[PDB]
Ligand binder design. Structure first.
Ligand code: CLA
Ligand code: CLA
Ligand code: CLA
Ligand code: CLA
Ligand code: CLA
Ligand code: CLA
Ligand code: CLA
Ligand code: CLA
Ligand SMILES: CC1=C(/C=C/C(C)=C/C=C/C(C)=C/C=C/C=C(C)/C=C/C=C(C)/C=C/C2=C(C)CCCC2(C)C)C(C)(C)CCC1
Ligand SMILES: CC1=C(/C=C/C(C)=C/C=C/C(C)=C/C=C/C=C(C)/C=C/C=C(C)/C=C/C2=C(C)CCCC2(C)C)C(C)(C)CCC1
Ligand SMILES: CC1=C(C/C=C(\C)CCC[C@H](C)CCC[C@H](C)CCCC(C)C)C(=O)c2ccccc2C1=O
Lengths: 80, 733, 39, 76, 152, 30, 63, 95
């Protein structure tokens, strides 16, 4: 499974969660930014690694980072 | 961690065909296996070197064995200029009768291959004469192959596993490698030249059974120990000496004559014996520099630490560099590959111009294969040198322990470095291409006198400083009263001045405008290839487009289509790009070497001097002209011994072109296609019964770059080798 | 007219006019002083 | 937009044909070619003498010097 | 002479080349009537060929065994027309272009939307900067001496 | 010929078949 | 707290497109729970076509 | 030239130089950059048991501590200088 990580520069704009095509990410309450929320990656076994989320992220230096790692039939996106 | 890649459970658990591919490709990257330690890393490398020695010895043993068993060495040594040397027999049941006849050459009783490796000239020059000589040599190397495997196995056993601290004892390894690996081996090699090779050249037969009863020199060791060393140079071979006979044979063992044995056209054996003795003394003294167990010698760390300019223009100088190097194996291998790459080119440049082996100068195809083989080997080795510099920067570099030192300061001004390589490459490309294109247009328009044809005056002035008189510059050794000329008049200059001004050897060939243009082509290739490689190494840790690149490692497919697109952003991809540029560069240098020599050998250098200043000349008068025998190795009218090279020539074009598929079409196209084949397979009766155990998937992004590169490189090399060998051997220059 | 003068200043238009003028100049120098290899 | 762009294309083609007929009229050996089509090579382009490029004006017959054309306009 | 060459004015292969070239054009010349336009044109090429070969001979160009002029760029004072002199002219013009180019980016760098004058040339501004190039060696040396040329 | 007719089919047909079959079973094992 | 509005600050976050350049302070979030409270605007977009970013007080230096 | 005389005079002077005129300087420098270290620690201290300095050989009852390694080191320079002088005189080189 690929690794996904969130860094605390995240402004909680949610754009990565909406971009994700397999629901890897969710918003969780946080006190660190004005939006009072931060991203989270509790379902990386469904993560395919398209990096649509990084494309969505506004922070100078990504707040969401995808490290491609061990391949499974889920990360490889196989339907067979 | 239970199937195929035992060192990578990450891969063992891949359910796709990708598992098998990457298991193969990562097997030698020890650092990235499950649960490697520093100790295991060193120990695996150490045993892996013994296996590499074992293969090298095994390979040489077979070459000896096959020449003795199926070659014509004994006929070659009796008439070295009229016998094509045999590599080995061929036994191919696909052959038709006309192929059996055409390949039956030499004095052989069946189809054979002719050797372009030069081993006959090599082995003959150093003393080998009989098939038996070759047999016991092969057996001895077989023994060395076996011993190398014994030690490899041994040192992987817990009782004999060396500690990390031993592998990092740098001062001791240097002392031993300089004085022993280099020095004693060179001293011993001079001992072989004096005891066996030189008597062989004078028609004597010195072997293990009799070498104790025969003197290498009539005065024994007396002159050695009394200091009367001149006696060993006293009575050198005549310039009319006939190699392997006593005709004009002298008794000197150590000389300094310069130039060539006039009949063999290669260096004097007594010069080569003196050379190996002299450098041995230097290695043996030099190997006493570093401190070991005896309370004298240097600390390399202290030496580095002391070399910091007062005034601060190199910050902290070389402080920290001992452990940066001594703790990083990629740093060490980078320096090793960089240095070996330089001297592999040195070998190619010096062997064609100052051959050591009797009767190799007139074996034109051998000289062509040997030069081409080492310049391509050298090119690959140079790209590896930078690739492991990059890997060093990612895996091993510690910014804090290198703070402000010469290595860190390279990273600080990478934009200065990279943008000047960029500038130098742009300058050389615009002008070199601009000048060739101008000349082409002038030829096109029937006005060759309007070419731009710059004389390589700086190099011609260097040839004149060396004593060549072709250009009238009269400098240094070309002068009449330079102290340089006066000091060497009594020693090596008579034989050297003779060789350098003989214009039918390869020592310092005459050069004009054609040599100017292609040397700037070559400088373009060196500059651009290092641009790719330096930019690759210096951005490996990070760029503005990917400031955390170090967190992703040396090779990764990319960083996705965001931030504008990031294909081919890793340091591994910069290497991949540089291979094309290295293959380009060596292509230019080897084209040049070959075309300069084939027109030399044919007796009309003017074909090169005139057709090389424009590019249509290269295409037509080099490639097209010299392809006619090769492409007729088989035709609707039959075939001949050039048939193999004609077939390999096209084979090379085919492999190269197949590489283009993996390089141009990328993964997603092929993954979707494979899916329709997964469907089709699971819906086809009878074939339904059979099921794959590994899910079929398109190759990885990086994988395809590699597979394409390998196809490209393989076809590149096979195409040119087929052409090189056929064109040169079809006529003998 | 001022819109037209703005368009005539756009990168491609200003480039052809500039390079056209340049080409004419270099062609006429080569018609008047052809075959110059030195200087 | 596509309708008027089509007119734009047709404008370009007619201008292209105008030049083809104009070069046949003004810079060709078509009149000479009619008397000897088996030998005279169709030519309808002539290069100005500059930087040695006159050599592209070839001896095509009909007392003419020019580039041999292969568009086939003469046969039309 | 230099690099074993000989002056093109003394070179036999140089003279042969001119002769073979004129003979080539005369083979075409003889196809056409002497008043005809092709005859005049081929004759114009012939005279230009003759002017060219005499010109290279009179300029001091050295020739190789090939009968072609070979340029001496080493610095030798008999051959400054082959590199030093046209090269000084190139650097003077090249620096003029670059200095003018930098003048324009600097002139517009503090404008409201600077990329607007990069895709739509402010030609009036450019006509005012185009002649700053005449003195780029003095202007560039002056900006250097007072910290204006390079940023820190 | 008495030995090439033995080793050429051995190293070019038998050994690769035995090797390819051996490696097929190791890579497929679990 | 933080630099004043319209302050000209040099960027000291290494991985930032504008590292060692300068931008203008838009606002400073006064909530002391905000880890990166200094909003900065720059005149050139980064590779994501974004022109503004939040920075820490230690990542910004008035000039 | 008598070889024994040249060799034994060269070695004599070299041994004399290393004992009476250059001894302090050579010792000072060896102390300055001492044993080779890997990561701040001598090869032996890191576990290279084969890197142990042979204190037994280094011991000497010579007043200044001139030991057997010094004799080998300065004695080698003497033999090298001697055989340079002998071989150089054996030839008839003319500059
Ligand atoms: C006298 C003692 C001695 C000797 C002879 C060696 C010899 C060697 N050591 Mg070493 N080693 C020593 C002491 C010694 N060691 C000590 C004391 C330590 C501990 C401090 C080590 C620790 C050590 C390590 C950790 C490793 C070695 C390795 C090696 C091998 C290097 C590979 C090779 O073959 O290079 C051959 C090199 C040469 C012959 C030198 C020539 C190089 C030039 C460029 C080539 C010249 C070419 C010449 C023109 C040839 C002509 C052409 C040809 C066709 C004839 C080599 C056998 C490596 C190895 O392979 O292990 C198996 C290795 O990994 N050593
Ligand atoms: C002393 C020589 C030397 C040594 C010891 C190493 C050691 C290493 N290199 Mg390095 N390298 C070298 C030379 C060397 N290299 C040279 C000369 C180059 C230039 C090509 C490179 C370029 C290079 C790159 C670009 C990379 C390495 C990597 C590696 C590491 C693992 C390699 C691996 O698992 O691949 C094992 C490979 C195989 C088991 C099979 C590979 C087969 C190759 C690719 C194709 C062979 C084609 C063949 C000729 C086909 C013939 C066809 C026929 C018809 C003729 C390892 C640390 C890799 C790494 O892990 O670093 C992080 C990496 O990416 N090296
Ligand atoms: C023949 C094919 C070819 C050519 C011409 C180039 C050209 C170049 N490559 Mg490239 N490259 C190639 C194949 C080629 N490459 C391949 C197969 C690969 C493997 C993927 C690469 C990978 C590669 C990398 C990774 C790098 C280069 C670099 C370079 C530059 C080298 C410096 C130089 O010569 O500056 C001079 C520039 C040229 C010779 C380009 C052509 C200039 C033209 C002829 C002038 C046109 C003038 C004319 C008015 C145009 C009219 C056109 C009209 C339609 C308007 C240059 C732009 C390096 C670079 O960018 O260095 C700065 C670099 O980093 N290349
Ligand atoms: C844009 C640069 C440029 C420059 C500096 C010149 C300059 C000159 N032209 Mg020229 N010309 C140009 C472009 C240019 N022309 C173009 C684009 C054409 C094609 C229509 C011509 C067609 C042309 C003709 C037909 C003639 C000139 C002539 C002349 C010269 C007049 C005496 C003069 C030096 C005349 C000349 O020198 O007589 C031979 C002349 O007869 N020019
Ligand atoms: C597809 C159409 C086509 C093509 C490719 C050519 C091509 C050619 N013609 Mg030809 N011609 C054509 C149509 C064409 N013609 C038509 C329709 C006519 C009748 C009006 C002519 C009448 C004609 C004559 C009378 C002559 C040629 C000549 C030539 C040759 C040299 C032209 C030259 O250098 O001009 C010089 C270059 C320029 C004038 C370009 C100036 C550059 C400016 C700055 C570009 C302006 C760009 C601007 C933004 C857009 C303006 C659009 C505007 C028209 C509204 C060349 C082979 C000459 C020849 O063959 O000599 C032996 C010649 O004398 N042609
Ligand atoms: C490869 C490096 C190299 C470089 C950088 C130069 C550079 C130069 N050469 Mg040159 N030259 C070279 C190799 C080189 N040469 C070789 C190998 C030869 C042998 C054929 C020559 C033969 C040669 C001749 C015959 C002459 C030059 C001259 C010159 C000068 C050019 C004119 C000038 O600016 O005068 C400015 C000069 C100076 C600022 C000082 C020059 C004097 C000092 C000692 C140098 C310039 C200093 C010419 C020269 O010096 O003119 C005065 C000249 O007459 N060169
Ligand atoms: C103001 C114009 C200008 C100036 C002063 C420079 C200056 C420089 N460039 Mg740059 N460059 C420019 C434009 C310019 N460039 C443009 C337009 C491009 C895109 C093609 C590049 C691409 C480029 C590369 C790829 C490289 C440089 C490099 C360099 C440096 C070394 C010289 C060199 O290689 O020239 C090279 C010049 C070119 C490759 C093309 C530029 C030539 C154009 C025609 C000039 C600009 C014309 C402009 C439209 C003028 C309009 C002004 C008008 C409105 C008044 C130097 C700092 C090199 C470097 O960094 O070395 C340290 C380097 O690697 N430049
Ligand atoms: C060292 C490399 C080497 C190479 C490349 C060759 C190449 C060849 N041999 Mg030869 N051979 C060698 C060594 C070698 N030989 C040695 C050392 C011996 C004596 C034991 C022989 C004895 C021999 C005989 C008797 C015959 C050949 C034949 C042949 C040809 C057909 C292949 C074959 O049957 O192999 C035969 C192979 C063997 C008998 C095995 C011995 C070679 C060693 C032990 C195996 C090498 C393993 C290899 C290097 C694996 C490396 C890759 C690894 C990292 C995974 C071919 C030209 C045949 C021939 O002449 O065709 C006309 C033939 O009849 N060979
Ligand atoms: C990235 C990196 C890297 C890499 C690098 C490289 C790869 C490099 C290369 C380099 C090289 C590749 C270089 C070369 C050089 C050379 C030289 C330096 C030479 C010199 C020479 C001389 C000096 C000579 C002289 C002479 C003459 C000429 C004549 C005779 C006499 C004499 C001898 C004197 C490393 C690993 C480090 C690590 C880190 C990172
Ligand atoms: C106790 C004492 C004493 C004594 C001592 C002595 C007497 C000493 C001696 C010593 C010696 C007497 C020593 C020796 C040494 C030697 C050596 C150490 C050598 C070395 C060698 C070498 C190294 C060589 C080399 C070589 C060769 C082999 C060949 C040729 C070349 C050469 C030369 C290089 C006295 C009385 C003083 C005082 C008191 C006390
Ligand atoms: C054509 C090819 C396809 C499909 C080709 C794949 C599926 C390879 C299929 C190869 C079959 C299995 C035959 C392999 C034959 C080799 C000679 C086997 C060598 C075995 C080694 C281990 C020695 C994709 O994988 C694609 C992936 C990334 C972009 C370029 C490529 C590339 O274009």
């Amino acid at each position: 499974s690929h690794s996904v990580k969130i860094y605390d520069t995240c402004i909680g704009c949610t754009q990565c969660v909406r971009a994700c095509p397999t629901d890897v990410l969710e918003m969780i309450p946080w006190g660190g930014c004005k939006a009072k929320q931060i991203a989270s990656a509790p379902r990386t076994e469904d993560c395919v690694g398209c990096k649509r989320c990084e494309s969505a992220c506004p922070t100078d230096f990504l707040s969401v980072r995808v490290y491609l790692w061990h391949e499974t039939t889920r990360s490889m996106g196989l339907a067979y | 961690a239970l199937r195929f890649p035992r060192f990578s459970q990450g891969l063992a658990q891949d359910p796709t065909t990708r598992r098998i591919w990457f298991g193969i490709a990562t097997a030698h990257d020890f650092e990235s296996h499950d649960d490697i330690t520093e100790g295991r890393l060193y120990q695996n490398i150490f045993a892996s070197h013994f296996g590499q020695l074992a293969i090298i010895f095994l390979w040489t043993s077979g070459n000896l064995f096959h020449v003795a068993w199926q070659g014509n060495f004994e006929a070659w040594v009796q008439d070295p200029l009229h016998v094509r040397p045999i590599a080995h027999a061929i036994w191919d049941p696909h052959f038709g009768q006309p192929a059996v006849e055409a390949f039956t050459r030499g004095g052989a009783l069946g189809p054979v291959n002719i050797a372009y490796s030069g081993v006959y000239q090599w082995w003959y020059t150093i003393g080998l004469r009989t098939n038996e000589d070759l047999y016991t040599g092969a057996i001895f190397l077989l023994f060395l192959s076996f011993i190398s495997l014994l030690a490899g196995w041994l040192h992987l056993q817990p009782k004999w596993k060396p500690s990390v601290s031993w592998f990092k004892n740098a001062e001791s390894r240097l002392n031993h490698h300089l004085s022993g690996l280099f020095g004693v081996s060179s001293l011993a090699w001079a001992g072989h030249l004096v005891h066996v090779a030189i008597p062989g050249s004078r028609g004597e037969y010195v072997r293990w059974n009799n070498f104790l009863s025969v003197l290498p020199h009539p005065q024994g060791l007396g002159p050695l120990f009394t200091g009367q060393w001149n006696l060993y140079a006293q009575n050198p071979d005549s310039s009319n000496h006939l190699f392997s006979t006593s005709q004009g044979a002298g008794t000197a063992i150590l000389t300094l004559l310069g130039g060539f044995h006039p009949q063999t056209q290669s260096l004097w054996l007594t010069d080569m014996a003196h050379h190996h003795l002299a450098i041995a003394i230097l290695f043996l003294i030099g190997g006493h520099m570093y401190r070991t167990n005896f309370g004298i010698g240097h600390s390399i760390k202290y030496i580095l630490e002391a070399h910091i300019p007062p005034g601060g223009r190199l910050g902290r100088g070389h402080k920290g560099l001992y452990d940066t190097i001594n703790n990083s194996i990629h740093f060490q291998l980078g320096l090793a590959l960089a240095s070996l790459g330089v001297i592999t080119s040195l070998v190619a440049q010096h062997m064609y111009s100052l051959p050591a082996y009797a009767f190799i100068a007139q074996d034109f195809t051998t000289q062509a294969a040997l030069y081409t083989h080492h310049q391509y080997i050298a090119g690959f080795i140079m790209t590896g040198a930078f690739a492991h510099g990059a890997i060093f920067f990612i895996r091993d570099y510690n910014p804090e322990q290198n703070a402000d030192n010469v290595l860190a300061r390279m990273l600080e001004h990478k934009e200065a470095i990279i943008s000047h390589l960029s500038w130098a490459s742009l300058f050389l490309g615009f002008h070199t291409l601009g000048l060739y294109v101008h000349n082409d247009v002038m030829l096109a328009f029937g006005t060759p006198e309007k070419q731009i044809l710059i004389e390589p005056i700086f190099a011609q002035w260097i040839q004149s400083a060396h004593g060549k008189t072709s250009y009238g510059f009269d400098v240094l050794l070309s002068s009449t009263n330079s102290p340089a000329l006066n000091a060497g008049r009594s020693i090596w200059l008579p034989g050297w001045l003779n060789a350098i001004n003989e214009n039918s050897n390869s020592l310092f060939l005459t050069i004009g405008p054609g040599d100017f243009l292609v040397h700037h082509a070559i400088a373009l290739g060196l500059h651009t290839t290092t641009l790719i490689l330096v930019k690759g190494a210096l951005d490996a840790r990070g760029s503005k487009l990917m400031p955390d690149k170090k967190d992703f490692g040396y090779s990764f497919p990319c960083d996705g289509p965001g931030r504008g697109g990031t294909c081919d952003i890793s340091a591994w991809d910069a290497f991949y790009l540089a291979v094309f540029w290295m293959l380009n560069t060596i292509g230019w240098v080897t084209f040049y070497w070959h075309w300069k020599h084939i027109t030399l050998w044919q007796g009309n250098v003017s074909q090169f001097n005139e057709s090389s200043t424009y590019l249509m000349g290269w295409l037509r008068d080099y490639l097209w002209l010299n392809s006619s025998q090769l492409i007729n190795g088989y035709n609707p009218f039959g075939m001949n011994s050039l048939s193999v090279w004609a077939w390999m020539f096209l084979f090379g074009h085919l492999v190269w072109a197949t590489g283009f598929m993996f390089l141009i079409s990328w993964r997603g196209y092929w993954q979707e296609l494979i899916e329709t084949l997964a469907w089709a397979h699971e819906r086809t009766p009878l074939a339904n019964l059979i099921r794959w155990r590994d899910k079929p998937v398109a190759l990885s992004i990086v994988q395809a770059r590699l597979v394409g590169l390998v196809h490209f490189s393989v076809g590149y090399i096979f195409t040119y080798a087929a052409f090189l060998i056929a064109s040169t051997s079809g006529k003998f220059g | 007219m001022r819109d037209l003068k703005t368009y005539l200043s756009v990168a491609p238009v200003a480039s052809t006019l500039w390079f056209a003028a340049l080409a004419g100049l270099l062609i006429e120098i080569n018609r008047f002083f052809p075959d110059a290899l030195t200087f | 937009k596509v309708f008027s762009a089509h007119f734009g294309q047709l404008s370009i083609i007619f201008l292209w044909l105008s030049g083809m007929y104009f070069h046949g009229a003004r810079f060709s050996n078509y009149e000479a070619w009619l008397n000897d089509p088996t030998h005279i090579r169709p030519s309808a382009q002539v290069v100005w003498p500059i930087v040695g490029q006159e050599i592209l004006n070839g001896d095509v017959g009909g007392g003419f010097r020019g580039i041999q054309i292969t568009s086939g306009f003469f046969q039309i | 002479d230099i690099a074993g060459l000989t002056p093109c004015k003394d070179s036999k292969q140089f003279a042969k080349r001119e002769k073979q070239s004129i003979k080539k054009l005369e083979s075409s010349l003889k196809l056409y009537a002497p008043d005809s336009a092709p005859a005049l044109a081929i004759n114009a090429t012939i005279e230009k060929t003759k002017r060219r070969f005499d010109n290279y001979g009179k300029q001091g160009l050295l020739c190789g065994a090939d009968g072609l002029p070979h340029l001496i760029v080493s610095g030798d004072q008999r051959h400054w027309g082959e590199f030093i002199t046209p090269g000084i002219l190139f650097l003077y013009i090249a620096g003029w272009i670059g200095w003018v180019g930098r003048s324009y980016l600097i002139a517009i760098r503090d404008d409201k939307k600077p990329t607007q004058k990069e895709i739509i040339i402010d030609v009036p501004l450019a006509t005012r900067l185009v002649f700053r190039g005449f003195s780029w060696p003095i202007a560039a040396y002056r900006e250097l001496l007072n910290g204006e040329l390079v940023a820190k | 010929i008495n030995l090439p007719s033995l080793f050429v089919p051995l190293v070019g047909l038998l050994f690769p078949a035995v090797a390819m079959a051996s490696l097929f079973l190791h890579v497929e094992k679990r | 707290i933080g630099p004043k509005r319209g302050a000209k600050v040099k960027i000291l976050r290494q991985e930032s497109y504008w590292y060692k350049g300068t931008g203008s302070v838009v606002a400073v979030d006064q909530d002391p729970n905000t880890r990166y409270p200094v909003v900065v605007r720059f005149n050139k977009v980064n590779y994501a076509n974004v022109s503004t970013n939040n920075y820490a007080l230690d990542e910004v230096e008035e000039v | 030239l008598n070889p024994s005389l040249v060799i034994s005079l060269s070695t004599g002077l070299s041994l004399f130089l290393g004992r009476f005129v250059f001894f302090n300087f050579q010792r000072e420098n060896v102390a300055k950059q001492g044993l080779p270290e890997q990561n701040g620690v001598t090869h032996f201290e890191a576990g290279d048991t084969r890197a142990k300095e042979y204190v037994s050989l280094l011991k000497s009852n010579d007043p200044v501590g001139f030991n057997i390694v010094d004799v080998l080191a300065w004695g080698s320079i003497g033999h090298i200088v001697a055989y340079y002088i002998l071989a150089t005189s054996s030839n008839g080189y003319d500059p």
